[PDB]
Amino acid sequence: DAEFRHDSGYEVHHQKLVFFAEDVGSNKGAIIGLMVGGVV
């Protein structure tokens, strides 16, 4: 994700992708909520 306004930062070799996947996994919950609607 944007660690700060989509700033640059390769971080590491591929562990960066691993972390991204985790972010994604968790996010899904909030994502569904948004799809439904905040006031829904």
Q: Which residues are annotated as a binding site?
A: 6, 10, 13-14
How far apart are alpha carbons 33 and 7 in whole angstroms? Answer: 27
**Residue numbers belonging to the annotated binding site for Zn(2+):** 6, 10, 13-14
Query: Tokens at residue 27, please?
Result: 């996010």
Residue ranges for the known binding site for Cu(2+) are: 6, 10, 13-14
Query: Using CA atoms, how far apart are residues 32 and 6, in angstroms rounded to an integer?
Result: 23
